[PDB]
Write an enzyme that holds these catalytic residues in place. Structure first.
Site, PDB file in Angstrom:
ATOM      1  N   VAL A  85       4.134  -0.545   4.490  1.00  0.00           N
ATOM      2  CA  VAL A  85       2.836  -1.290   4.880  1.00  0.00           C
ATOM      3  C   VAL A  85       1.976  -1.998   3.251  1.00  0.00           C
ATOM      4  O   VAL A  85       2.226  -0.970   2.690  1.00  0.00           O
ATOM      5  CB  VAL A  85       2.040   0.500   5.215  1.00  0.00           C
ATOM      6  CG1 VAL A  85       0.771   0.059   5.586  1.00  0.00           C
ATOM      7  CG2 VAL A  85       2.416   1.633   5.919  1.00  0.00           C
TER       8      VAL A  85
ATOM      9  N   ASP B 150       4.704  12.246  16.374  1.00  0.00           N
ATOM     10  CA  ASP B 150       5.339  12.741  14.707  1.00  0.00           C
ATOM     11  C   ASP B 150       3.859  13.380  13.552  1.00  0.00           C
ATOM     12  O   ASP B 150       3.238  12.367  12.708  1.00  0.00           O
ATOM     13  CB  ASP B 150       5.318  11.574  14.324  1.00  0.00           C
ATOM     14  CG  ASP B 150       6.276  11.816  12.992  1.00  0.00           C
ATOM     15  OD1 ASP B 150       6.277  13.169  12.092  1.00  0.00           O
ATOM     16  OD2 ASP B 150       6.448  10.470  11.941  1.00  0.00           O
TER      17      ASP B 150
ATOM     18  N   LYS C 189       1.648  -2.987   8.522  1.00  0.00           N
ATOM     19  CA  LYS C 189       2.914  -2.399   8.986  1.00  0.00           C
ATOM     20  C   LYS C 189       3.733  -2.691   9.567  1.00  0.00           C
ATOM     21  O   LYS C 189       4.548  -3.565  10.227  1.00  0.00           O
ATOM     22  CB  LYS C 189       3.040  -0.620   9.526  1.00  0.00           C
ATOM     23  CG  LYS C 189       4.392   0.085   9.841  1.00  0.00           C
ATOM     24  CD  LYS C 189       4.271   1.909  10.274  1.00  0.00           C
ATOM     25  CE  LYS C 189       3.610   2.609   9.189  1.00  0.00           C
ATOM     26  NZ  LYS C 189       3.730   3.821  10.060  1.00  0.00           N
TER      27      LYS C 189
ATOM     28  N   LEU D 165       0.717  -1.143   0.647  1.00  0.00           N
ATOM     29  CA  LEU D 165      -0.315   0.356   0.056  1.00  0.00           C
ATOM     30  C   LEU D 165       0.905   1.622  -0.041  1.00  0.00           C
ATOM     31  O   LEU D 165       0.384   2.280  -0.386  1.00  0.00           O
ATOM     32  CB  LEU D 165      -0.711  -0.049   1.203  1.00  0.00           C
ATOM     33  CG  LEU D 165      -1.935  -0.580   1.085  1.00  0.00           C
ATOM     34  CD1 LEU D 165      -2.478  -0.979   2.446  1.00  0.00           C
ATOM     35  CD2 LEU D 165      -3.158  -0.885  -0.122  1.00  0.00           C
TER      36      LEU D 165
ATOM     37  N   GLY E 122       8.301   3.423   3.274  1.00  0.00           N
ATOM     38  CA  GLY E 122       8.372   4.238   4.777  1.00  0.00           C
ATOM     39  C   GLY E 122       9.931   4.583   4.675  1.00  0.00           C
ATOM     40  O   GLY E 122       9.986   3.631   4.451  1.00  0.00           O
TER      41      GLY E 122
HETATM   42  C1  LIG Z   1       0.386   1.644  12.314  1.00  0.00           C
HETATM   43  C2  LIG Z   1      -0.074   1.913  11.156  1.00  0.00           C
HETATM   44  C3  LIG Z   1       0.136   1.007  10.179  1.00  0.00           C
HETATM   45  C4  LIG Z   1      -0.511   1.355   8.903  1.00  0.00           C
HETATM   46  C5  LIG Z   1      -0.689   2.143   8.248  1.00  0.00           C
HETATM   47  C6  LIG Z   1      -1.328   2.815   7.060  1.00  0.00           C
HETATM   48  N1  LIG Z   1      -0.491   3.356   6.584  1.00  0.00           N
HETATM   49  N2  LIG Z   1      -1.245   3.248   5.388  1.00  0.00           N
HETATM   50  C7  LIG Z   1      -0.132   4.653   4.172  1.00  0.00           C
HETATM   51  C8  LIG Z   1       0.766   4.778   4.337  1.00  0.00           C
HETATM   52  C9  LIG Z   1      -0.416   3.650   3.480  1.00  0.00           C
HETATM   53  C10 LIG Z   1      -1.550   5.546   3.145  1.00  0.00           C
HETATM   54  C11 LIG Z   1      -2.986   3.029   5.026  1.00  0.00           C
HETATM   55  N3  LIG Z   1      -3.178   3.192   4.138  1.00  0.00           N
HETATM   56  C12 LIG Z   1      -4.276   1.992   4.833  1.00  0.00           C
HETATM   57  N4  LIG Z   1      -4.884   1.745   6.268  1.00  0.00           N
HETATM   58  C13 LIG Z   1      -3.739   1.939   6.404  1.00  0.00           C
HETATM   59  N5  LIG Z   1      -3.498   1.794   7.919  1.00  0.00           N
HETATM   60  C14 LIG Z   1      -2.258   2.623   6.421  1.00  0.00           C
HETATM   61  C15 LIG Z   1       0.048   3.878   9.455  1.00  0.00           C
HETATM   62  C16 LIG Z   1       0.144   3.222  11.084  1.00  0.00           C
END
Ligand SMILES: Cc1ccc(-c2nn(C(C)(C)C)c3ncnc(N)c23)cc1
Length: 450
Positions: free
Chosen positions: A200, A305, A214, A192, A195
């Protein structure tokens, strides 16, 4: 005394877990263990016992069993849900009053050429010795009768009540005692996003639940310290914070959360559908985040953050704060010293950068930078400036100027967030109050009837 406790099923539920107890809406059950998210119950029918989702049941004949009652929803959320696509003119909900504890309020969808679709709120006064009314004229013995009446001609109300606000069956809670889960329980499907300390991925947990995962690169954080911090994170449950379901404790560490269909607020704002969001909507996004931060403020936690990249957007456009507190367990020597191309210098309060003095006040500073990202549709902060130049300019008194499409009142809030002295920055509780009611100029938001 040890009185048998009975409840009624508000929805159907199919057992997916071993000790799960399946039930269909309406069925009544006896509560055996009241262990948080899951309760051990007994079926008055098959006399069978098992665990059930505590949010799927309620006291018998309680007010939560009605189609027109919405428990625990705030005024602002009542507006967002009623305004969501799928509802219509006259759509309503009776909810607990936030202003007059113990009493009730009616929320009704309305429309006029000047403001467009709106949601009007009416106080429902509770008369001692029984009785309910919005108008001392049309009094009723029960809320149901109140509904049936106004359901037949507006009788003064901005509109004639049609049907209850649309609502989707609550998602099943996460499996009981499934905090630390085996890596193999997850099936990672597609990437997705990326970072600096992890990626992710979209995934499925035990072939039954879609989640986001993540993955942190090995050595990116202290495994022991992460776990301790994650145990606090998981308890910060609020509608404006992404839910943290579980973790995989061995490197590479996995942080499993709910999946948000529209990605980060940053990507969303820079997208097509995002460019079409009017200023009032951007302000509402800001109010939602402030609401989430006020919750964090109340629980004595710190995001560390806060920025648009760390705000997620659901399919219904609800903002969910993500990554709260994670920065504290990153190992990176430069990051720990608030230095380097990996550290969020442009969003960080001067005292946090200089002495590592992170507090809810350094987040307030961050929220101010976030406000600017939002009102500018995701533009980078201090465009063209380097980290060293920003740090120097701020010490000199410089502050990003107000953009053309940014109202002065909104800019004034930003400026208060960027006070050099942390104690002079407002609380998120205040910020939320100012943003929730930023519009509808004059007002005591409570249509009086008639
Ligand atoms: C601890 C944690 C876990 C996942 C995410 C997360 N990052 N991202 C992106 C960056 C791809 C938009 C996501 N996109 C959809 N659903 C999500 N949950 C996330 C953020 C923090």
């Amino acid at each position: 005394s040890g009185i048998r406790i009975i409840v009624v099923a508000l929805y159907d539920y199919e057992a997916i877990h071993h000790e799960d107890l399946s039930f269909q809406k309406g069925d009544q059950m006896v509560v055996l263990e009241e262990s948080g998210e899951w309760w051990k119950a007994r079926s008055l029918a098959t006399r069978k016992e098992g665990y059930i989702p505590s949010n799927y049941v309620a006291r018998v004949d309680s007010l939560e069993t009605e189609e027109w009652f919405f428990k625990g929803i705030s005024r602002k959320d009542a507006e967002r849900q009623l305004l969501a696509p799928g509802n219509m003119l006259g759509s309503f909900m009776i909810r607990d009053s936030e202003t007059t504890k113990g009493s009730y309020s009616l929320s009704v969808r309305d429309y006029d050429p000047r403001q467009g679709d709106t949601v009007k709120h009416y106080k429902i006064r509770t008369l001692d010795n029984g009785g309910f009314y919005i108008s001392p004229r049309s009094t009723f013995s029960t809320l149901q009768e109140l509904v049936d009446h106004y359901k037949k001609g507006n009788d003064g109300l901005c509109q004639k009540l049609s049907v209850p606000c649309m609502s989707s069956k609550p998602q099943k809670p996460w499996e009981k005692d499934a905090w630390e889960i085996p890596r193999e329980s997850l099936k990672l499907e597609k990437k997705l996003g990326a970072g600096q300390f992890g990626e992710v991925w979209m995934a499925t947990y035990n072939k039954h639940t879609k989640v986001a995962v993540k993955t942190m690169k090995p050595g990116s954080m202290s495994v022991e310290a992460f776990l301790a911090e994650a145990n606090v994170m998981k308890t910060l449950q609020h509608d404006k914070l992404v839910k943290l379901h579980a973790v995989v404790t061995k490197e590479p560490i996995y942080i499993i959360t709910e999946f948000m269909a529209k990605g980060s607020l940053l990507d969303f704002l820079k997208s097509d559908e995002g460019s079409k969001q009017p200023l009032p909507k951007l302000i509402d996004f800001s109010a939602q985040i402030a609401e989430g931060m006020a919750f964090i403020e109340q629980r004595n936690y710190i995001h560390r953050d806060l920025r648009a990249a760390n705000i997620l957007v659901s399919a219904s456009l609800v903002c969910k704060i993500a990554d709260f507190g994670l920065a504290r367990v990153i190992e990176d020597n430069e990051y720990t010293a608030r230095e380097g191309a990996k550290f969020p210098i442009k969003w960080t309060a001067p005292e946090a950068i200089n002495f590592g003095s992170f507090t809810i006040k350094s987040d307030v500073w961050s929220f101010g930078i976030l406000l600017m990202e939002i009102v500018t549709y995701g533009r980078i902060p201090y465009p063209g400036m380097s980290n060293p130049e920003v740090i120097r300019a701020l010490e000199r008194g410089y502050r990003m100027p107000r953009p053309e499409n940014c109202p002065e009142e909104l800019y004034n809030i930003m400026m208060r967030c960027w006070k050099n002295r942390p104690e002079e920055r407002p609380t998120f509780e205040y910020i939320q109050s100012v943003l929730d009611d930023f519009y509808t100029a004059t007002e005591s938001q409570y249509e009086e009837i008639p």
